[PDB]
């Protein structure tokens, strides 16, 4: 995260760490959506251009963390994956279209002050909140600059109009994507950065006061450059696939 601030304790209890067993290293962020399911960007698992193809034994998910490197004894819970599920029409060849994956844990994790699930949007929550101008929050242990934080970082950024999003880049933008960030003018900064991938973009509903995940950190070009925006997977547009695997696969 760029131009963010340290998160407070228990501020994003759905925040998860994608961690490589060997070498031991942070891979990506992720979000806890139930006690057995984690949501991430498909590209954190599979990206052929970079020789990236991780399977279930390759990874560990770490929940309830604050500290980027420290093993938070008695706070954080580390699970094993039972299964990875990538969106069948994820496009790693052109534009990361449909960049979403589900991971099923070996066992259900127990909730606590630091570990708690986020809500998936419903059709109207999405209707009223996904509006240019409205702000969401992004969290992650990613780079600070286009360094690495000591603790989870957070940033609030506005949703940008689709046209403005298209006009900022040469990559073809689809309906399964939204972009967010301030306008060069607006003078206020921040963005997600490398290492933030697969974390959540959440919004707090003013109706019921719950936090809903609207996006997944997906891609961008540089971090916090003027006239450039962060791109997130549009979770509500992919909910059918999500609903769907959770009932087939448990």
């Amino acid at each position: 995260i760029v131009e963010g601030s340290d998160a407070e304790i228990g501020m994003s209890p759905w925040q998860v760490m994608l961690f490589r067993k060997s070498p031991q290293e942070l891979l990506c962020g992720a979000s806890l959506i139930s006690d057995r399911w984690v949501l991430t960007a498909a590209h954190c698992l599979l990206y052929p251009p970079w020789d990236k193809n991780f399977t279930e034994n390759d990874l560990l998910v770490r929940i309830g963390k604050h500290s980027r490197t420290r093993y938070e004894r008695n706070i954080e819970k580390i699970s094993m994956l039972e299964k990875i599920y990538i969106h069948p029409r994820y496009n790693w060849r052109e534009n990361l279209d449909r960049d979403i994956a589900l991971m099923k844990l070996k066992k259900p994790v127990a909730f606590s002050d630091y570990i708690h699930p986020v809500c998936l949007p419903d059709r109207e929550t999405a209707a009223s909140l996904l509006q240019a101008g409205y702000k969401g929050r992004v969290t992650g242990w990613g780079n600070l600059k286009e360094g690495q934080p000591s603790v989870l970082q957070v940033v609030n950024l506005p949703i940008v109009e689709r046209p403005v999003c298209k006009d900022s880049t040469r990559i073809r933008i689809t309906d399964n994507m939204f972009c967010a960030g301030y306008k060069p003018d607006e003078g206020k900064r921040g963005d997600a950065c490398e290492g933030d991938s697969g974390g959540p973009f959440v919004m707090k509903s003013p109706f019921n006061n719950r936090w809903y995940q609207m996006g997944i950190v997906s891609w961008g070009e540089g971090c916090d450059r003027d006239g450039k925006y962060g791109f997130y997977t549009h979770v509500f547009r992919l909910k059918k696939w999500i609903q769907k695997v959770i009932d087939q696969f448990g």
Partner: peptide
């Protein structure tokens, strides 16, 4: 720079 995690995790 990652502090080592407990082996039962591996």
């Amino acid at each position: 720079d990652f502090e080592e995690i407990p082996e039962e995790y591996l």
